[PDB]
């Protein structure tokens, strides 16, 4: 699930 900011 990490660590993610966008798309």
């Amino acid at each position, epitope marked *: 699930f*990490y*660590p993610y*900011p966008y*798309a």
Partner: single-chain antibody
Amino acid sequence: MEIQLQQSGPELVKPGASVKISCKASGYSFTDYIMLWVKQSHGKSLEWIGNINPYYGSTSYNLKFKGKATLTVDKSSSTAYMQLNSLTSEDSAVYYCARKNYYGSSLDYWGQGTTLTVSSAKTTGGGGSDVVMTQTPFSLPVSLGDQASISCRSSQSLVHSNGNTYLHWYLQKPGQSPKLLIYKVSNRFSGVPDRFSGSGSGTDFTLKISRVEAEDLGVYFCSQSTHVPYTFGGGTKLEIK
């Protein structure tokens, strides 16, 4: 323990050499947040260099820095690195690392910056389909107490599929690192006063300061992260007459 991003000290290097800048994170779970890096040539805007996901060690770069900058992480020491190779005078700038969150896709915590001077001296210290962010005015002189309004226009809608608009405002006080002010159009970040308010939609956005105070002076940057690559506006300097 409050979050802190602590970068390595100023560097003086010969053209052609390489430099490895560090960014030690503390106060949060290092592998749960993307670490982004930004370049700021003296007097110019912020440029996205690339991102690293500390959990996977996977990266993504701004096309122009791909092949120039190498982003790595050391999870044991909770430290991120950026190596720059074949340095020239055009690499002289301040580089920042900054934590990027998911909920806002914004840069909530910034390092203090690392000044790199590329020199033989012994002492001292494109377009494509990228979304373009245009800020107006370039400069806004006021008397303290005045209200202020600055605008930011994107070359295309920043409305995202999930219905959110990832348009944020940052404030960089003279000599300091940028700080997040407003994320996702109108949400005030922690500790940001009510005199600041963000509005707008699609491609048209505005930041308002009902009453300018001394601590508000500096350069305001809008940025979008709805589309990759991330892009920043050119900056609006708020200063006293």
